[PDB]
Symmetry: D2
């Protein structure tokens, strides 16, 4: 049962809009909105959205598998060995937010301080002592972006698995000699860095020039979560504020996906007339090029929504009904909607490019969608015995045979997958967890969870006190 | 009673080295080490130090006043008006960590997200609504380093006050016309940005070319905290590990200051032979040029400790007894001392250049000295009624006349000074507080507080859980 | 009669290899090699070539017209108006080396000091006084690369004409309002800068993603000069030294073009066995990415010449017979061929990326192919009366009615085309001329002209003396 | 007899202002203005000047010797060996425009293409074959500014000699071991690069913080050429146009030097009232920071000419009589004087920062002062036999024992000094010569030579024709 199975199960249920029914539904962890910083919903005058993995949640593991297959096929097409075609995507291996070390060809799970929590070379999980040879301080400088690449998006899941597949394949293929920084095939040397660049380039190619979009749109039921509560929630937002879309995707793809998301024989509620998806938005902006969007952006263009092409020229005019924009900047949105930053709740899945930058550069309020949480929360409550045993052990230790701590940490972690929880390894929080806490005001498995709280709701987090204040 | 009066009072007391006496002394907030992340002291094999405001704690407000006077005198010498000479340093105005906005000439106290907590134009404290004209979202982009300068060092205290003095002076002097971005004097226009640059340049000049060092060394009792427990603590560190100095200051100044710090008619304990300060260190490095030090650094040089000048050439040799180094990098230290990052406790006062960079770039353990805490802690326990009333009010509010919250916030804040606590304004934490929590493993008013804990001590912080884990 | 008609006429003639016949043939301007700096041919141990417009000389105006048509079609496909399809390439308009001013939308012909010689806005040639409003000093800063783009390649000929067509079209189309920096179409504004970027992007697209290569290879007789003397000359070079190819083009295109260039029912001379084109080269390098090639370059790769794809890995091995390389650097060539810079004669058409950089960065000897010279030389000798009259007028003037100088300058210039000679306007030399003189040791309409000189030939230029030395 | 002895001899003669006397005087090479590009003097509406080595020509070798002595003294003061004090400036060694190779510690004289003409390691002149080990292609990449420093100013003369003295000293001092890239003194290694940086820093220090200016102003007769014809020429310029000063020097130094230059018991001509130097200028600008001046510059400031300090603020007002400016940009000058670039003749000695940038960035007309020409011209006419013999030999060779060419080249070169003529080595022109030809419209040993031509004079250079045009 994948996280998207959980989401689709919840999506299939019609909304019970009775106040006590809603209040009772959000008592369950699965349907809750979680709060890092207090947020008075009455102060929000604008709700903004990304599309991919926010409005359009791609089903798992089918979508990652398609991405994986197409990326493999591209690498074979440019000259990688035929044996790559025997790889098959395995959803139990990758966890999001891992760091690929291009020097030594390892996937690393790290905390917020760059300390190593997990290290795998191909499919070999390297134990603590063996890690010291390459990482003498069990530490990486994570801002050394020439060396380290952080795989923090859901689109990076297939390449995370593919990197480990390739390191495994080359290591075990007798044609190649394994060296510290790559593989020797006689007079050819393939560094892990060059191999990584080929994989990154191929994923980009699949998305931007290959058939991923085409294959997705040909079978939207297979690939995209559909929820009749989506139009309902967006209609309620528009009754109390303005609603906008700001997506990096192009208009033609956006229109296909959004049309499917709204394709029900009714509008917001059963029995109401169906309305086109564009009617749910005060402002629609495509080709946003986030994160640059939150600084200088690019010139504001107007989409000819008949031809799907850009009108020639920079658009200098006002916000009008039926206009679709392309490019621009976060300031365009603010100015056109008459909004200040703190009036905006921006809802997206990109912990860096969406949520971090909108918060740091503009002071927008943020809602982070974390699709994996829909399954991680099930594991967390099912296996709470293991975590509680770890707490008790960490407590008893502070005052001999702490191999027990390592073993319980392992058993706990394996419940989430080979690379453990997105949010921790045992008692140590990941970089990803720390970034969520720091930059997401609110977070949840889905933004649809906002449906279960009234719009006057005050989301509350406890005040933080320093050690000397306590 | 200044924070340095508190420190010197504590410094005057001889150490009672009985185990129960030590254990009882660190029960008091004033003598405690505070813990952001757990730290097993038995794992530390090297203790590293900065000099200024760490080993050599400059007395307040005398030292800031000297800096202020010399900076004023430099500005008058280059052509600023004679009226500047009537300014007098006021220690009740500046709090460390304020942001000077060079566009509008305001000092701002901000939280970690750039939200405005306090705004003053000269000596006029601007209320919330009047702030909206210049800061529509009550927010600044703090990484816009062309516009904003963050005054986060103790050496920045005099310029913090001086900026406000100058904005006040020019505003009220009939020769100048106040404009949005500076002052017009007929055919001359002085922007706040140019005025800020002159002040920054003059502070630099005072430190590097003027008489600040000379005036300091002429009266070390007036300007520098002296504590017989300093040699005792450093001797105990050297019994269990290596000790090093890495200072941006030059050897001639370092030698004067350190000689004074160790000038007692005894060594570590009363009755022991006096030993030269250099004997307390396994490695002494001057001219460190931190923060660059924690990346590429500069070439390693050797000090001729007789002439005080650098020997010609890059030093290629080993760590030898009696050698003093200049420049180099953090890697030099690690290699020469045979240390990995996590083996090192680095003790300093610069929350950015010392503590942030050693943690982020190298994974060193960190101890932040915060001299103001020695007085802030007294205010915090004396006026705990006001804070507790604020908690109660914030609680009751969450479920009308919240002018009461603003008033109590003001009365609380004014107990610390005109710009409030270093760590908060009312219930909102400052940027500085957030940076301490994030990058200082341990912190205290003085590193001497380590004397009251055994070297096997396990400093403990509670584990952090995300909202969905709780 | 185009310059490529002249070249093909000369190409059709078999070589008369009698020494007196050769000596007599190079007496004619058309078949001469011109000399800017003395060059002893006996010191050359390696001959290096670019492909495009050097070995493969594209016929004119057919090739420029194809490029033009495809670029227009791309712009219409992305949303430019249908009226663009009525444009037709005119070879009488563009001269190579013009500067597009993106601020004001003018094509400019300039001297080496940035002084204006010709200015056209669309098809309107702007006279001297009217030029002063936009160019107060009749001067541009040609290194302001954000504003000015220098159209110095033969591939830039179609876009040179297309820019002028578009400025004309928009100016005269009643839908748009002409402004100083572009065109207003209601709420859309198209700056000349944005229009220029669309044209540049479309030319790139045609070459790299569109059908230009495909259409070229489908009709090589229409598009490419073929000369049986090419194999003869290259065979003679290989008897006295090494021969290499270093092309930015990919192997698949290179192989098609080169196969056609060598497709005769004989080898070097009539009656000899045909040999594959690759046999004429000691080293073949594709994907060179000049000008970067002359600095750090990219990693050296090996082409699988069966699949046409790159082998995986960096190539670490020696120069072997039958190997084809991709990427690398100029140092790769030198090292693999055992050559020093001055041992190499590098033959190409790119006055910047080939010839300038090989000379300045590596001290290679240079031969610049200037295909237009094959026709310019005919105009120069036919209309020498006009130039001689200009000399006489310039002489008489130096010691009233100099409108005569302007008129004769115009009549002379118009003999070459609307934008005059590549090398001058009247008595003023162009930037392009100055760059040829400075960086081309030797130059000619075709490198085939080397066939008419023996390999011991000493090419001689007169020594340069400063004014004070004369 | 130094070049400044020649200049002062010419300076001592009063001006004979009879038209036939002037016309006859400029017939002599010494008093001529040389012409690279034609310049109609009637089109010049503004004459602009640098001060140092233009208006204020420092006597040789006294001034270079003072610079040398002070630079040596600074290096000894920071820890260089005492033996440096035994060095004594030798004017027969340095020629301007040499390249210091920081990798190998050689001074190189190069042509415009980076080809080696002379190589010296310390005082050892390295012959052609021995040069090949370090320079395999007898070539350097002169834009590799990390490695090569071009000593092209008259202020660089003392450091040119000092670099060679230091390489000689360290090579021959038994304490140091000579290595390929510097000197080893046990555990210290001094690279040529670090040694070069210390010398460069010390020259800067002497000029900006040391006693060079003070020692100069204490004995202006010893150090500065004084010519009663200077006020006469400047007065004549002001009758036909505007006159400005734009100097990097500060006002206090400028005022001392300029006061001395105008200190005669008369004004422009004998018998006229003396006038202050400032009266000769329409605009006076100090602290110019050229070459940045010719781009963005710095903010325009006003000098308080009583206090010598800057008024506070950016100066926003008009050009007024008696105002002195500081900083600004070349555009300030143009706007304030109502000049276009080609209306300005800018007169200076810096072939890069003055003359190159004013020409390339602004299209100003240029007059380069080359003080050494006053003596080089004497050598050129005295030893014309040697050059003529070289021409004849180069001619006879083109159609065996060319050791004769090398010997005559040597004897010729040695007439100018150990590093030969500024402008050539034998028949090969230097980089400096090529830069003069390219960027100086006019040049001379002194700008005073303009006095001998009427202001309607048309300076004529012959038109340049390409090889194919001839
Ligand atoms: Br699509
Ligand atoms: Br001192
Ligand atoms: Br092709
Ligand atoms: Br002075
Ligand atoms: Mg990378
Ligand atoms: Mg600033
Ligand atoms: Mg451009
Ligand atoms: Mg250098």
């Amino acid at each position: 049962t994948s996280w998207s199975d959980r989401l689709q199960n919840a999506a299939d249920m019609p909304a019970n809009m009775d106040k006590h029914a809603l209040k009772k539904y959000r008592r369950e962890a699965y349907h809750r909105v979680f709060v890092n910083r207090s947020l008075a919903m009455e102060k929000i005058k604008c709700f903004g959205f990304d599309m991919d993995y926010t409005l359009a949640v791609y089903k798992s593991p089918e979508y990652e598998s398609l991405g994986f297959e197409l990326t493999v096929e591209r690498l074979v097409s440019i000259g990688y060995p035929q044996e790559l075609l025997s790889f098959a995507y395995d959803s139990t291996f990758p966890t999001r937010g891992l760091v690929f070390d291009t020097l030594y060809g390892n996937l690393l799970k790290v905390d917020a301080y760059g300390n190593l929590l997990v290290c795998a070379h191909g499919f070999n999980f390297i134990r603590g002592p063996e890690t010291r040879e390459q990482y003498p301080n069990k530490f990486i400088q994570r801002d050394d972006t020439e060396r380290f690449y952080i795989l923090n998006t859901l689109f990076n899941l297939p390449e995370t698995y593919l990197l480990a597949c390739l390191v495994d394949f080359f290591t075990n293929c007798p044609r190649y000699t394994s060296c510290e920084t790559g593989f020797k095939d006689g007079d050819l040397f393939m560094s892990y860095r060059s191999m990584f660049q080929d994989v990154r380039d191929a994923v980009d190619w699949v998305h931007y020039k290959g058939s991923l979009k085409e294959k997705t749109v040909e079978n939207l039921e297979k690939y995209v979560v559909k929820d009749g509560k989506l139009p309902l929630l967006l209609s309620r937002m528009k009754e109390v504020g303005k609603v906008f879309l700001a997506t990096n995707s192009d208009y033609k793809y956006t229109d296909k996906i959004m049309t499917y998301l709204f394709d029900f024989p009714h509008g917001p509620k059963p029995g109401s007339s169906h309305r086109p998806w564009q009617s749910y938005f005060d402002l629609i902006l495509v080709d946003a090029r986030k994160p640059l969007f939150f600084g200088e952006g690019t010139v504001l263009r107007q989409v000819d929504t008949k031809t799907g092409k850009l009108k020639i020229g920079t658009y200098t005019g006002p916000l009008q009904h039926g206009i679709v924009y392309s490019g621009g900047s976060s300031d365009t949105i603010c100015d056109l909607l008459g909004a200040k930053g703190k009036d905006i709740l921006y809802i997206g899945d990109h912990i860096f490019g969406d949520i971090l930058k909108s918060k740091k550069r503009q002071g927008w309020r943020t809602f982070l969608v974390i699709p994996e949480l829909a399954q991680e929360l099930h594991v967390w409550t099912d296996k709470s015995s293991l975590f509680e045993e770890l707490q008790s052990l960490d407590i008893f230790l502070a005052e001999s045979i702490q191999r027990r701590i390592k073993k319980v940490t392992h058993d706990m972690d394996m419940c989430y997958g080979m690379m453990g929880s997105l949010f921790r390894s045992g008692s140590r929080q990941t970089l990803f967890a720390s970034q969520v806490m720091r930059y997401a005001d609110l977070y949840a498995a889905s933004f649809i969870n906002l449906l279960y709280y009234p719009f006057s709701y005050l989301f509350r987090a406890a005040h933080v006190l320093m050690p000397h204040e306590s």
